[PDB]
């Protein structure tokens, strides 16, 4: 809407929309397989639903969605709910991967497709990036000069290309904006999309279950921010994790806010 | 930018400087000349190279492109092997080999817009990948006795400078793009079996192709040529040659 | 200069000095040998120069300086450029080492020599520290009472001394301020100097390529700051790191500021 | 207390001449002599430093303020000179085979250079003004240079064949190279043994003082062959011994340090 | 006027008419074909 909004500082604070947004909204948790493994119970979902019922969320409003691993979830995530919580295990051997997952789900991306064979692409601004998903993505790039030949690489000999990814499920790639790059991708197993980073996604909430805060959403090295919906916990079990989430679910959803852009079940919009 | 772009950097009334940036699939082939001396058949006169034409048709990104390639060699070394002065010893007066000091020239031409009226070219440059040329097995068919076989020889061709050239033939004349290649000797050596010669690097000039249809190497080239503004002009390609009537 | 400056708030915001400081300044990266190894290319320096050229930095202004180890670099770091970037890997076993390196290059020091045998020294303020460089430094110190005797140590028995370093290439030693210490140092391989910490060096920018923020520049255990020319990346390759540094070099140089004190190549001033 | 800024300072002409800073600058400052090994050799004593310091004491320089730092030869000192003191004196022997060496040394220490690094393999450099030079240090420097033309080709030299290059230096420990300003030069240097730096000459260094012990004034500091100056801190002496030289330096240290002024930087 | 001059008697957007007046030393040679 191009039009403006007006208001006033004399009007009164309305009642709490909590205890109604719960009813008319759905919640969805994303837990790892490790949780159900350490639990070894078959009714923990109904248990947690009966617990949420005290906090106000009715019976058929909570949902749980298993994901075997961070990368197997990073492979084309699909968050289709009204309030998403993600529980993310920390591992220094997966830091950039579980930061790219954050950069993908916390934010809202507008993605076009890419045809590497017929075209050579480039990034315009500091919000255009190349996000690639699949089972094993090996991405190499050769930057180009004014006459469409190679710079420290041979436009044909793919060994001379510069390797930015090695058998990765989800890669988020930023290159020098203002030059044309020739790409080599495992197109059989991975799809790559030229995506622009729009305003953030206020529907989801990442919870790092272990180590200190490391997620650097912004690809630029200067900022390294910590948003409100990027939480941290210290853990030794998973039942305590889930009881803590259930006990402090009001704060989480107060840190989250329903979306404004559109209705969409993927983690990225498509505009061809 | 497309992999097969065509851009205009200047345009006057009749002429225009057109830039071209295109990928190519050079499929070339050696060809050997074998001259056997008379007598019984135990003496060979020359085993040398001959410039070799090869025309093919490959698939671009949704287009069919006809091509014409011509391989040649320069600066080859002339070896020889003479084991006796009698008519019954196997002798080879002169045979050619390729090493570092030699070069491999490859003229290339296509039916594309870049080579339609190309007579002037600047800003020439190319990115070519390196390949490995391996020799084959040539059985010297002696009249009687044993049958020595020249077998082996491997040598790696690496990209080098680029220039222009003209492919002359009895059918077509082509103002073509000349790709050079330098040689780095490889591990497989060539040796005449049943003879006192072996473990000498290079490539033999008897069967270089190794029973192959061609040697394939992919590349990209980028130039700027003078093309008349009107995209209907044509430069003579075909020929009708009657040269060397004295010969 | 001692005089005062005066100004106004009506005066206008002059044009961007970027795109001229790039022409009239130099940039120098300090990368690890690990990066050259993982790259395995002999033209990546020219590649990055041609890339920077699009960002405005001309050809002969960008420089690269290989350093094999954080400690080998910590041995008398020689920064002589107008804009220095340092790429620093993360290792828990080298946390204090790569923190002392930061503490040394980020800040500006004024150093006098130390003659351990002939004299006995003390610290006066919370910025008068003892920095020791060399290939293998093993330092021991004995505090002394009012009447030039030992406290928990003997003036003669070098084994009673209190060890603070064990074969460390760079050490920054802070001892109690107000008491005289008798030192024992491997002077054959190391030089120790009594230095005072001045205002910060705004010419250098550290970039922790790996794990969580650990650098405690200030020795006091109360601040635990994080300055502006101190960044953090999460990484799996190095070409992505370099493309990132390039695409975001303008933010880096906006986070840095050319020096004020003087022209110097060492990381510390000498005044005898 | 504003740093990095240059502001106008005012004054008058009726103010009185303040007291002498000498006899206090000595106590709050340090002095450092740079003498050759020849001198200690001729002396053949192990207490001459203590002797000279006890003598300095009478002129006001206390014990722990004076320092002596030995160097074996002019070129071995030319290799990365580290003059880090509040007052520096450098005794320098005269030899016709080393005139350029001990002119380059003077040009390097007497003046305060702003040195940026250099990467020969990638970049081709040029000198912009009459103060931009290339100073190379090390144990054996051998420098060759090819001027280039507008289209990045050579001028009496081939960009590839290093032999065609023009040799300006041949196994020198310190070279200060000035080439024609305006033409990109490609270089070849023994980078294994020498480091070369693009240095712009700023205002002089008033903290050092060269003392030529022998022959006449030869030092052509200024590369331009028109000035041929002789600054106040470029001294000369005649010698048949070294004890006389040191006694003279001591007895006239006050004039020396009146000719020397502490740095600005 | 030199011996090996190079002049531009006209100049259009791309082409140009140039005049060349140069000295040369033609070092030529015959060759015979014998057939027995
Ligand atoms: C808001 O809360 C107050 C206090 O409980 C209550 O009296 C009021 O009725 C509420 N508002 C509405 C619209 O019911
Ligand atoms: C200052 O910036 C404005 C806006 O780009 C421009 O029009 C003007 O010419 C600039 N002036 C100077 C002196 O750079
Ligand atoms: C300056 O010198 C005069 C004459 O020697 C002396 O009387 C005066 O006290 C000196 N100034 C100071 C501040 O001591
Ligand atoms: Ca990844
Ligand atoms: Ca490469
Ligand atoms: Ca970018
Ligand atoms: Ca340390
Ligand atoms: Ca003790
Ligand atoms: Ca202290
Ligand atoms: Ca010299
Ligand atoms: Ca020459
Ligand atoms: Ca000059």
Author numbering:
A (entry chain i), C (entry chain g): 55 to 326
B (entry chain 2): 248 to 494
D (entry chain k): 51 to 315
E (entry chain 1): 248 to 283
Study authors write:
VP4, activated by proteolytic cleavage into VP8* and VP5*, is the principal membrane-interacting partner; VP7, held together by Ca2+ ions at its trimer interfaces, is a Ca2+-sensitive “clamp” that anchors VP4 onto the underlying DLP. A major consequence of the reversal is projection outward of the ~250 amino-acid residue “foot” segment of the VP5* polypeptide chain.
A further classification step then yielded two maps from 56,593 and 70,018 subparticles (classes 5 and 6), respectively, with relatively well-defined lipid-bilayer density (classification #4). Local resolution estimates for classes 5 and 6 showed a well-resolved, virion-bound VP5* β-barrel trimer with its central coiled-coil domain and a poorly resolved lipid bilayer. The angle between the curving bilayer and the VP5* trimer axis shows that this class represents a reversed spike near the edge of the contact. The coiled-coil at the C-terminal end of the VP5* β-barrel domains extends just to the inner lipid headgroup layer, and diffuse density extends beyond it into the bilayer profile, but peeling away of the bilayer leaves nearly all the engaged spikes at the periphery of the contact, and the resolution leaves uncertain the molecular features of the likely membrane-penetrating elements. Two of the three tips contact the liposome bilayer, while its curvature from flattening has probably eliminated a contact from the third.
